[PDB]
Amino acid sequence: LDENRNLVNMQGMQLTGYPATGTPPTIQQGANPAPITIPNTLMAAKSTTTASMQINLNSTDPVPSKTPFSVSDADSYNKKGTVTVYDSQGNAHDMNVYFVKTKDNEWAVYTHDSSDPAATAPTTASTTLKFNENGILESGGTVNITTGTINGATAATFSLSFLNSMQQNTGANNIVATNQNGYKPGDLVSYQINNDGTVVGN
Amino acid sequence: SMQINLNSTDPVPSKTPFSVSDADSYNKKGTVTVYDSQGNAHDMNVYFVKTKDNEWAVYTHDSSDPAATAPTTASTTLKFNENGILESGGTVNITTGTINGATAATFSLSFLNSMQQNTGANNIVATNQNGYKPGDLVSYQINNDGTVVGN
Amino acid sequence: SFSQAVSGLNAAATNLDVIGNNIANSATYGFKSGTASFADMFAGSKVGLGVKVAGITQDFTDGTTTNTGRGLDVAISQNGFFRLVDSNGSVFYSRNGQFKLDENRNLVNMQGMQLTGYPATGTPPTIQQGANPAPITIPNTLMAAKSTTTA
Amino acid sequence: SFSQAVSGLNAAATNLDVIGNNIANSATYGFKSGTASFADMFAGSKVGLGVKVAGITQDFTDGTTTNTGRGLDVAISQNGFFRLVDSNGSVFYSRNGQFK
Amino acid sequence: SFSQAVSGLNAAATNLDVIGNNIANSATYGFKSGTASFADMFAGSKVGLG
Amino acid sequence: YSNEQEQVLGQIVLANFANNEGLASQGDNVWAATQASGVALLGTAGSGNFGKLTNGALEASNVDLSKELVNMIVAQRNYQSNAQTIKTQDQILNTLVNL
Amino acid sequence: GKLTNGALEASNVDLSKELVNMIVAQRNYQSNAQTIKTQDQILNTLVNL
Amino acid sequence: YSNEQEQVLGQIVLANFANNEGLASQGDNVWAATQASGVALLGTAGSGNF
Amino acid sequence: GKLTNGALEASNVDLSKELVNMIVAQRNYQSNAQTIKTQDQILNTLVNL
């Protein structure tokens, strides 16, 4: 690895290969080979556009006792989960998702941003998950969610998904999977060459 | 040139106004060593103070000049867009002080490619300048492309 | 026609010298082994004119960390290089962490090269992570007292 | 060529002499161990001319304190050195506390 | 190579010295026993030096 | 200090290079940055792209004696093979001159 | 530091460390001797041409 | 000296030439300055081109 | 310097450092003999013309 960040041999000839273009970068094989370079260029942040939360629900859960909803009161809801998303500047937004059982196989989910101190607590249903005769999610698996505006950064709106969520006689409500496509800025830590020839920077 | 990365989560310093002695009065301090006409080294200190989200006042001082006036006015203002990219205020013409009668150097300090996002903390990515001091011949070489270079 | 045999003998001698040097510096804290890299020198004809040494490549893999114990001793893990300056201001880098304080109380290694770093200034002193690196000193002067201003 | 191996042998011999001095001095009140520090001798070429002994560093770690029952025997804990004078007035410093 | 066994021997010697010191203070009012804590020394390679 | 208070005198700076193989060794276990190695990137231990510092310890050399001895054997054999080639050319030239 | 009366500061030489270092040093010395032997054979080969 | 004070007596000078190859060897591991090598530049060790 | 009674100053010849120098000087001597032989063959091929 020379001073200009190119992969060269002992004599200085530059190694060539298919370059990566786009966001997220992928190898475009339709282009002519170009010299391979490894810049330190900090990686910018990606505001979230798609988030997913797969969860399993208990059938035997009783309905919340203390109507109405309060994000402060624990006994006011059945479950609470946290998903970390990222805005245009990479700031962390901690979406708290609240599960309240309304009727049989019907679960209202509320969304509240806890990272923004001036955000109002939701009072109306964000979505109503409907589970069929046996866990099988029926409707309401996808909802548009808008972040708060924190420290002048652009609020990131995204589609949050509950696909493949199930509601059966599970012992308790616990989160199975949470994923999101956003990330915060990062600096180059390492580089490697895979057995398929791809150069990957971590 | 000074490429820096700033954190968007930094609180505004409490101690107004900015004071060089007061560490609590500014967010970040950096140093760049420039050279005047004769060759004396001027350690220009650049101070970044956050005022409002997407706004950073920048002050400059000369740490090599004992007679340099205390900075009381903001030298410039960096404004970053909602995506964290610098929009305006990235270039400013700055003049150093006079040491032992040497002519002060007026140079353009540029904060190009500086970005404000959610990093770990305020870190200076790179600093550079095109001035230097007197140099004596140490070695000579002939490179691969035939160019003769003296180090 | 010894064009090839002489070059091969020279390359073998260079490789053997590199191996012997690696053997000799086996107990040199901060030493990295070296390996010669060879290349052929075909020139117009297909007869294979000879061989040449394209260079000597270091092996910058971290060595075993041995707790000698002496406090000043500092071992470095992963990437990084200790920064030193000689008496003439030139900048050098070393992985050897065997340091001592000289008579002027300046952190130096066995060869007297002054260890550098970010100095501290002010009252109380703060690490000037921006200030250009300076030689580190450990003065023995008595520490003054600060009048109580906040309790 | 020969110089690199000669320097390596000399450095190894110096290390072994330091080890022998330490091991012969295992029973010596106030003695401090020694360790040889080596440095390479690159000069212009990348071939690595050899190694050299940069110096011998003492290890001033406070040793175990052993009682003897003599009133003139005193040991320096932590840092500090006994100051002594010879016949000519020259000054010297020693950690050994056996006085008569 | 040798460094691994050297580190192991030094750790064993430290443990032996700690045990001997604890035994020597079997009758020492207000004394609290000591125990050495060990940790591996992996560095880059998967060999796990010492 | 003795007044139940401490001071900070300095912070050791670390250097990282784009090209480790480009550093030219000047001897005395010391490296110098040149054109091929690029400019030194300065920082602190444990932050950015720098490893932390171990106190009371020294980093030994990464020279394994077994590999060095085996490579010495192989290189000796290669040197003797090249010497045999030289002898072959010597005999060829002697044969031609004796004509 | 303070002074303790009626006692002496013993040496800080730990014997096991010295023995292990001696073993390492001797082996290093043997490796360098092998290097000298190899270069001696090289010079003999070149002379006997 | 014996009075616990050192005194300097002189400094060794180093000479560098524009053309080292032009020096006329006089034997006894000794070189002499000539017109081809040019006038010797004097200085101190560790500074400039010394 | 000081005088120590009941003691003798031994020689300062280290055998190891000497044997190595003996090997090196042997090689130098053999190289010079090889040069002599080369000049001898030079004179031979000139004479036999």
UniProtKB/Swiss-Prot annotation, chain B:
Domain of life, source organism: Bacteria
Cellular location(s): Bacterial flagellum basal body
Similarity comment text for this entry: Belongs to the flagella basal body rod proteins family.
The protein, known as: Flagellar hook protein FlgE
Taxonomic source organism: Salmonella typhimurium (strain LT2 / SGSC1412 / ATCC 700720)
Shown chain mapped onto the complete sequence: 153 to 303 of 403
